[PDB]
């Protein structure tokens, strides 16, 4: 009956001690440790976007008129609200505004056609009034009182498979922000890239530690982004300290840097997925890329909250593929068979993700239904899983339990 049913104990332990991730984080929740970022360091800069830079003080001012505006439109606690992705400050402003309003923004790529903007706005529920005024330059308001609920949702994000409106809810969100903050040491003097568009969600992971730490979010611009020489004497000039990349992007860079040695010494940490990568290219970026930067290999759908799996990326290999590694805190992987049997060590299988992490679900009832499912994994629990389509083993690394990527179904 249980998915571990066929397993012995020594296979079962394995899975057992994988997945023990259990983790405690302090404190208030994320908008409340955001407010408290901002009120002790007011004067430290919050976003370094295309048209200038704001202060904490000045970001927590114009999301406070966006709060004021949408609860004078009748926006009530609980609604959808798009936000114009664009890589200027005002998108900034718009989607704080909408969490501080009890809501959950939406990111609209604002050169999408017309009728897939539509489609978004009607399948996310979302009131497109940030998208038809500048969200900037909106009167000056505080933020209403919004009444405490556990849980609310905090963004709608798109991805494909035909696109699906992901529904993120705060307990997912403040998870990330807690790994991404202490795992890479996360500090008020960092500057922290962000690669992504608002529409991606490794945005997420920069913005939200950026702004729970009083560290500095800084956008990387679009021109420098096709240019990998620019991108790495631009990385040097805004002295990054943590960096997104999708792993086909870092493959763009290493070439520049093979053609032309940089030096990066204020990069600390490149959180780089998307694709399976080898230690041949990762052995190369060590040797061409004078800096103390270490990479860690991350996987994950949007569905799990942008990351479920990281790997330290030892510089010293030079031969194999990089393992995709271990669940983050409060995540727990499952690689099941097509009859839902947890696979033994060194058996491929589908990964099923549980934990803090998962989506409430998609917009969509009907895809949410075939995506999420229940399963007694072990004797006594019960995981509610999201099916990835995603294929994975578990296997020794280094004398430690890891997951490596197989593929897709
Ligand atoms: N380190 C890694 N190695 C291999 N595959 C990885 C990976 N990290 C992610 N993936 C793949 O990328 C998928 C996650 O995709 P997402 O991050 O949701 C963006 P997408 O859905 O590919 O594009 P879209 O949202 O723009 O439509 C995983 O399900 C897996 O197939």
């Known amino acids: 009956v249980t998915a571990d049913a066929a397993l012995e104990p020594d296979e079962r332990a394995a899975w057992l001690a994988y997945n023990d991730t259990a983790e405690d984080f302090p404190g208030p929740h ?21 048209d200038g830079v704001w202060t904490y003080r000045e970001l927590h001012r114009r999301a406070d008129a966006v709060a004021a505006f949408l609860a004078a439109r009748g926006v009530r606690p609980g609604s959808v609200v798009a936000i114009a992705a664009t890589r200027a400050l005002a998108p900034y402003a718009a989607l704080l505004g909408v969490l501080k309003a009890g809501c959950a923004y939406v990111p609209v790529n604002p050169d999408d056609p017309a009728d897939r903007v539509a489609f978004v706005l009607a399948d996310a529920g979302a009131t497109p009034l940030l998208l038809d005024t ?29 696109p699906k409106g992901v529904v993120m ?19 008020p003097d960092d500057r922290l890239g962000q690669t992504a568009p608002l529409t991606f969600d490794p945005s997420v992971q920069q913005v939200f530690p950026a702004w729970a730490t009083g560290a500095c979010l800084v956008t990387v611009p679009d021109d420098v982004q096709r240019d990998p020489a620019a991108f790495l004497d631009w990385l040097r000039a805004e002295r990054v300290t943590h960096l997104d990349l999708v792993t086909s992007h870092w493959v763009h860079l290493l070439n520049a840097a093979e053609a032309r040695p940089a030096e990066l010494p204020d990069l600390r940490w490149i959180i780089i997925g998307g694709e399976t990568y080898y230690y041949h290219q990762t052995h190369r970026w060590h040797r061409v890329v004078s800096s103390p930067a270490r990479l860690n290999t991350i996987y994950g ?15 010293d290999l030079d031969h194999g593929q990089v393992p995709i590694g271990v669940p983050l805190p409060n995540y727990r992987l499952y690689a099941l068979d097509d009859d839902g049997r947890l696979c033994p060590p060194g058996i491929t299988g589908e ?47 280094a004398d430690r339990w890891a997951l490596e990527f197989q593929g897709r179904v």
């Open 301 to 315: 759908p949007t569905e799990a909250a942008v990351n479920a799996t990281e790997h330290l990326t030892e510089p």
């Open 169 to 187: 809810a705060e307990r997912a969100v403040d998870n990330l922000t807690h790994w991404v903050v202490r795992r890479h040491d996360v500090r």
């Open 30 to 50: 994320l908008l409340a440790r955001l407010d408290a970022v901002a009120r002790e360091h007011p004067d430290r800069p919050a976003v370094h976007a295309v």
């Open 134 to 162: 500048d969200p900037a330059s909106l009167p000056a308001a505080p933020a209403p009182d919004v009444p405490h609920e556990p849980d609310r949702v905090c963004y709608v994000i798109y991805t494909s498979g035909r």
């Open 351 to 397: 990964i099923h993700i549980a934990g803090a992490g998962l989506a409430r679900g998609y917009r969509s009832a009907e895809a949410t239904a075939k995506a999420f499912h229940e399963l007694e994994v072990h004797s006594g629990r019960t995981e509610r899983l999201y099916r990835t389509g995603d294929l994975a083993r578990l296997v020794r690394h």
